Ligand binder design. Sequence first.
Ligand SMILES: Nc1nc2c(ncn2[C@@H]2O[C@H](COP(=O)(O)OP(=O)(O)O)[C@@H](O)[C@H]2O)c(=O)[nH]1
Ligand SMILES: *P(=O)(O)OCC(C)(C)[C@@H](O)C(=O)NCCC(=O)NCCS
Ligand SMILES: [Mg+2]
Ligand SMILES: [Mg+2]
Lengths: 87, 381, 115, 68, 133, 217
Amino acid sequence: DMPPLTLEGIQDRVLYVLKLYDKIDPEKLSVNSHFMKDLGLDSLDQVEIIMAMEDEFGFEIPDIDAEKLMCPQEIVDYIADKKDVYE
Amino acid sequence: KPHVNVGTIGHVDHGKTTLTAAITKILAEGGGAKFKKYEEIDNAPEERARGITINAAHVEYSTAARHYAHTDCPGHADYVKNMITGTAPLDGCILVVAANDGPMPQTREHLLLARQIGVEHVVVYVNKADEMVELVELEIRELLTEFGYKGEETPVIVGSALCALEGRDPELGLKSVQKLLDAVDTYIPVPARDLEKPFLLPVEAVYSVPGRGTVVTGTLERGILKKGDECELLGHSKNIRTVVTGIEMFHKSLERAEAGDNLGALVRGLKREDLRRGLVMVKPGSIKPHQKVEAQVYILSKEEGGRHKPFVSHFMPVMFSLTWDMACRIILPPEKELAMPGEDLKFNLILRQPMILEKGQRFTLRDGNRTIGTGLVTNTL
Amino acid sequence: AIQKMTRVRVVDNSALGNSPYHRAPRCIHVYKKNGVGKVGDQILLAIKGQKKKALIVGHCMPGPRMTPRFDSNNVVLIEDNGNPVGTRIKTPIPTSLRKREGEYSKVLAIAQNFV
Amino acid sequence: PWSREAVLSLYRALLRQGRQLRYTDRDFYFASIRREFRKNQKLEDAEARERQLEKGLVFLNGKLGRII
Amino acid sequence: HTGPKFDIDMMVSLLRQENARDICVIQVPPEMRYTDYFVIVSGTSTRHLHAMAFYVVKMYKHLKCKRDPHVKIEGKDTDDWLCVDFGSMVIHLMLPETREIYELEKLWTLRSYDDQLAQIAPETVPEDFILGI
Amino acid sequence: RFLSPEFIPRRGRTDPLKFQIERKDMLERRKVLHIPEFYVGSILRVTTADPYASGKISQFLGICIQRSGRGLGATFILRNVIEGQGVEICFELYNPRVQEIQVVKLEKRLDDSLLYLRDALPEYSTFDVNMKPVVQEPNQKVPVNELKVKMKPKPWSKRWERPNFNIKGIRFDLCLTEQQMKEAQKWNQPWLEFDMMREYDTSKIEAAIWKEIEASK
Ligand SMILES: Nc1nc2c(ncn2[C@@H]2O[C@H](COP(=O)(O)OP(=O)(O)O)[C@@H](O)[C@H]2O)c(=O)[nH]1
Ligand SMILES: *P(=O)(O)OCC(C)(C)[C@@H](O)C(=O)NCCC(=O)NCCS
Ligand SMILES: [Mg+2]
Ligand SMILES: [Mg+2]
């Protein structure tokens, strides 16, 4: 099965999972705010977030790069590598 | 070789076990399947499950047409336990009647519970015929009419069970068993298997991952799970509308589910607080909870470990079905004052809260850490 | 054999047992028909100005052949309930404790080494 | 720690094992591993970080005992 | 007699239906000469723990092999901790209070490496065997 | 040649047939489980079945300190300090419970008993639980450790200084005084070295045991 990977649709599903999280609430959640500083999340907290991305798209995230992923915007750009979106 | 289960049923000393010995004995001559001695069948192997001890004799006979499995029980109390619990469910049945006795109100219960096991195809055999034989035959057709069968199309075969076993009468004993062999190959010889029914999942565990949502696990018995299906959870006066996101088997994603498999249903946009064990997973509008239910429950004898004192109406046991636990109240049907151990009869038991109960839903009644009854749902009221 | 007025060693992580004190713990009483106590037997202790029940776990006196023989008299402090006051047993305990008659399962649960 | 990567790797790897759980209550297993990584961490000296990491590493291996 | 055997899968499912709060089932290797399977389950109240323990033992006897030895429940007098030993399974019934203080799962998963063993240090006698204040 | 101590019987009024019976039984068991040549100083690791469990396997490593008993009931005792606890186990050789006996380090000490190791410093009895076997060429003299061991303070399990024990493997100079040594000498018994009827020669006896053993294989 081939899902249409619209950049806008990618954004929606990314923010969908973050509002599902207990620690962070949609009130202070934004597209441009980062997890660690802006959303005030620990490094261990991050690991769980990336796991949410892991099973959703079903492509493996190596531990070497998982570290540098500290922003939702970074993620929507990273998963754009999976299927190139231009728009 | 299609394989189905078929079991003998009738009054004591109607030559049920002799026929069971005979049907495997004739096949032994041809060498169809392994045969057991009559005396060996007399001694029934013990089966123990869910605090219920049962002496069930299982003999396997393979006819040329199709493969068959056969069940025998020493006692009536043993017979009822088998079919209510449905340890080995039977697609067909053989009703055996003696020439001297024929129908009897005790044998009525056998066919009365046969309505509840979802079997509507029966075979009648007459033994001990060594015009009076033909006199008893017409009542059997009428008897089957009373329960809801049409008596006319039912096969009634004259013979002698002992004659077949000893092989002394080829025209009587032998001709009978082949007729019985042909009758079963005529009535429901092919198994019934379909998954058209909406799926029911009793939730075994509630499992939550942040950034994934609640995963609920259950074993399939009906229906097929598909992704993106709008679904309903109901139980303990909690009913919410949601959608299936993912299905989990061997920690992998799969689109289609199968009966007899433990599947992990992934759900989104819900709280773990609300989702607990005791909930049931079905399609909406399919089923509804039933507070008051009619059911035939077998009350356990003192011998097995059931309570000595018989109970009166407004007794409060513990009801166990699927994954949910609740206590209930038993009102005894009129004309009866008390319900003694070792005797099975229909009740109207009323749950504390409306909880789902459908036809053929097996259950056990309990008092703390003791089992007093096992029953099957006959009607929802 | 641990009898009345015997010095014992408390082999626990319990505060009461491991606390520095001027007296070694003494066996007040043995809960057996005859006074001698072997392994698995319960005995009463005078420690730090209080009475406490204890389970004998290994001793210096030779026992049955294949059973181990320790170099100190080791006891575990227990409540009257049967709940051990301490959480961990550093020192090895004999495996024989398992089959003997009584409440030994909890003490086995908190032990690390079997000899 | 010994390595900032290694601890985040360990936290990852342990949670992956949690999915494969069969008998053990999976909600409790996750809760138990979370709180361990919280209260212990954020406050330790260099030498004891070598010990606490190893404690987790033998948990990963499960040679001495595996939770199922 | 014949049918279901005594093993984990049956035993755990048996527990779960009495609202076992948390279940930890631990595979123990043969070098640790105690049991095959260690089990910890929590409870709501003291009388709830008795309910479970007494059901499990009762059901055990039902499915028990003839030669399979009889078992004894431990610590009925005790408030918070109950234990039952089987042939190759060991079960511990506790309050959440006692789970917080015993940490049985930690002991058995990682033996010599647990935090509780670290705090306690072995005491050595001084050389030449002289104490000084 | 090396004959196991158990085979040579003690002086008794026991009829020879009783020993023949017991020897045959021992030899059968030896075929099933290999009994290694070990001495009192040597290090052994013994694997046994654990009856208190469901047939789980227990191994214990330690230094042999004494070897005694005759016939089937013949035994040896192994010592070791496990994580700050001294442990001694007496093992039967012909117990069916034992799975395997291996010689990890085969050596003799100065004296035939080492029960004084209880009174010796802890480290002399502390042996690593997991150590690699060290093996020597078959036609080599059995190596002797000439270690003498330092002691704890003088209250001991037994009075080792007394000449009846005849301990050669203790650093007496370190612990005792000269006056204590001369005090111990009051128990000397110098005639006992030359008591002729006190001696027990096993020459012909061992020869006949050899004859039986070579017949067995
Ligand atoms: N004359 C005659 N007697 C029979 C026949 N079948 C069974 N019996 C008698 O029934 C008795 C055994 O009953 P059994 O089959 O054990 O009873 P069930 O198992 O309760 O049906 C024997 O004493 C037989 O003599 C038959 O075909 N003819
Ligand atoms: P993250 O940015 O919240 O911090 C990572 C960390 C908590 C795992 C850790 O590197 C840290 O900052 N503190 C070190 C103290 C510690 O306990 N180390 C881990 C040993 S298991
Ligand atoms: Mg019958
Ligand atoms: Mg002494």
